Amino acid sequence: AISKNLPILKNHFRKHWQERVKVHFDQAGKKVSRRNARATRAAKIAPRPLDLLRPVVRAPTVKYNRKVRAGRGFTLAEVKAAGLTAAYARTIGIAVDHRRQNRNQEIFDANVQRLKEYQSKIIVFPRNGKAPEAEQVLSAAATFPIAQPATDVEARAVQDNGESAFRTLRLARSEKKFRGIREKRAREKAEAE
Amino acid sequence: WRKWNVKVNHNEKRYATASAIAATAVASLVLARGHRVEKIPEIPLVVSTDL
């Protein structure tokens, strides 16, 4: 059962695994069916851009803090700032997030500017017009790309004061570590007459 | 669930493609393939883009 020098393996195949095996033979088939569905869907909404204008958003964790991505919908704060209503925007392809908040100005401006860029670059047909077909684009995401904002210039002056940036990390960790203990010491000094 | 498709490195594919294009211009390999190019004035045979 166990024999010469090999890595110890864990192959979870003690259930009736052979009944639940899926081979994705239809990889090519599904892709064709998906492109057809995209093709037919775009025709049915012939002038419309096949997508809703999605917002810009910072990724949650500390791992993806550095990255900014396409979110779900625009905040009602952002939409009011642009000058529109959620009921109207949902009809002109601007997806709206009621659960989202804005606690950050740069996301606020980047999304509002995304909104003004949308309005100036789209034309809404009146309900009783002549439907002047206007060369539909199939992607609102590709029309307004999500570009990561730039942080600083590529070359600046060097300034130094003598911190090493290592002491400040050790101090920040250590101050945090003993902060709770230092309150209890200060509480005792508060009660000691 | 027998393995049917086998993955080839992209670069090796383009390596073998470039080798196959390069072997196109070699007369000896084209005859050895049996491609009846004895009456072709030159190889690689290139025609005007009217065709």
Binding site: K15, W17, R20, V23, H24, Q27, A28 | N5, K7
Partner: protein
């Protein structure tokens, strides 16, 4: 409005008003059949907040189920297997008593659709519940688009498959880290994470 008063009073279950009404009502309901048709709901506020409306085609049934564990139905308690499966007595039914109450009613009034159900009373042997049923082929429900969704065949025997409030509670259908085993369905989740996915170009 008066339903807010009914709401606040009904929370005062242990008070003497509710306790006295409890004893006389539970005796009255027990004397009747284990499932019988309630002319009106005993609580206007509970029935209507769960989806009842005082209109033709909306129904309320009063039902009592037996309480306690579910004894393992084996002759002489012989389970014929490993000791871990030797238990007979202290085994618990996985569905609620509200679920069996409204499944038993749904079989009685099989023409209707179970909208909801709620507790009305309890004693040592019987838990008492009121079931709300909606007549799907009553034209007052076929029209009035606030209610006709239940006429669609995808809502046949919702109580049977666990689509009622107690049915969603028993299947553990809720958001959160606490329901990871039961989000898309426990059996659906299990089959999904017990499938060997093999792509054409093997990963």
């Amino acid at each position: 409005g008066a339903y807010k008063y009914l709401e606040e009073l009904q929370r005062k279950k242990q008070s003497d008003v509710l306790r006295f009404l409890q004893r006389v009502r539970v005796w009255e309901y027990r004397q009747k059949n284990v499932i019988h048709r309630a002319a009106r709901p005993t609580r206007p506020d509970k029935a209507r907040r769960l989806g009842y409306k005082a209109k033709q085609g909306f129904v309320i049934y009063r039902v009592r189920v037996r309480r306690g564990n579910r004894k393992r139905p084996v002759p002489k308690g012989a389970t014929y297997g490993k000791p871990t499966n030797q238990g007979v007595n202290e085994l618990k039914y996985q569905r609620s008593l509200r679920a069996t109450a409204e499944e038993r009613v749904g079989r009685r009034a099989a023409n209707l659709r179970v909208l909801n159900s709620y507790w009305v009373n309890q004693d040592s042997t019987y838990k008492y519940f009121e079931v709300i049923l909606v007549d799907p082929q009553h034209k007052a429900i076929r029209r009035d688009a606030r209610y006709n969704w239940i006429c669609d065949p995808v809502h046949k025997h919702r109580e049977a498959r666990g689509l009622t409030a107690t049915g969603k509670k028993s299947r553990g259908i809720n958001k959160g880290h606490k329901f990871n085993n039961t989000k898309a369905g426990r059996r659906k989740t299990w089959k999904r994470q017990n499938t060997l996915s093999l792509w054409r170009y093997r990963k």
